[PDB]
Amino acid sequence: SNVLDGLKYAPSHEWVKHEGSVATIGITDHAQDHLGEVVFVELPEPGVSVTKGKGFGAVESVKATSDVNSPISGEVIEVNTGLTGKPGLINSSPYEDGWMIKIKPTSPDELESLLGAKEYTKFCEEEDAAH
Numbered sequence: 001s002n003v004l005d006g007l008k009y010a011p012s013h014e015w016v017k018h019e020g021s022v023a024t025i026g027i028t029d030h031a032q033d034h035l036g037e038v039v040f041v042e043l044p045e046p047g048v049s050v051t052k053g054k055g056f057g058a059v060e061s062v063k064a065t066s067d068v069n070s071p072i073s074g075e076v077i078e079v080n081t082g083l084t085g086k087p088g089l090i091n092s093s094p095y096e097d098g099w100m101i102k103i104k105p106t107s108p109d110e111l112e113s114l115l116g117a118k119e120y121t122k123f124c125e126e127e128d129a130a131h
């Protein structure tokens with residue numbers, strides 16, 4: 001599991017990349033690895049609001065269907081419609097082409113409660129080690 005240096009991470013294995021007025025959201029390399037082959041993604045409609053810590057979509061693999069929760073609150077301004085044709089982009093590039101939603105974050109300080117990269121790598125170590 002690759003973990004990128006400038007993202008913030010939630011315990012449930014979703015990342016946020018923040019770039020000013022916009023925050024992009026996807027699930028991590030860890031998350032796709034443990035999901036297996038992703039066969040379907042349920043993404044929200046544009047204009048919808050997402051709230052920090054609440055499911056905004058689901059990702060269906062050959063073995064599981066999990067909720068993907070929003071790491072921060074805001075408004076879905078854009079959705080990766082690429083995931084309809086190739087869902088697998090989540091497996092092949094969880095941090096670049098497999099991004100799920102782009103939001104306009106409504107509460108910026110939310111970023112400060114998320115895990116930075118060493119805290120998330122460590123938590124993933126503790127999870128891998130918990131079996």
Ligand SMILES: *C(=O)CCCC[C@@H](CCSCN)SSCCO
Pocket residue numbers: 011012013014027030031032034035059063064066067068069127
């Ligand atoms: C197979 O049974 C694995 C279930 C899928 C687990 C992964 C879901 C990530 S989608 C982001 N919410 S994460 S590993 C277990 C929980 O930390």
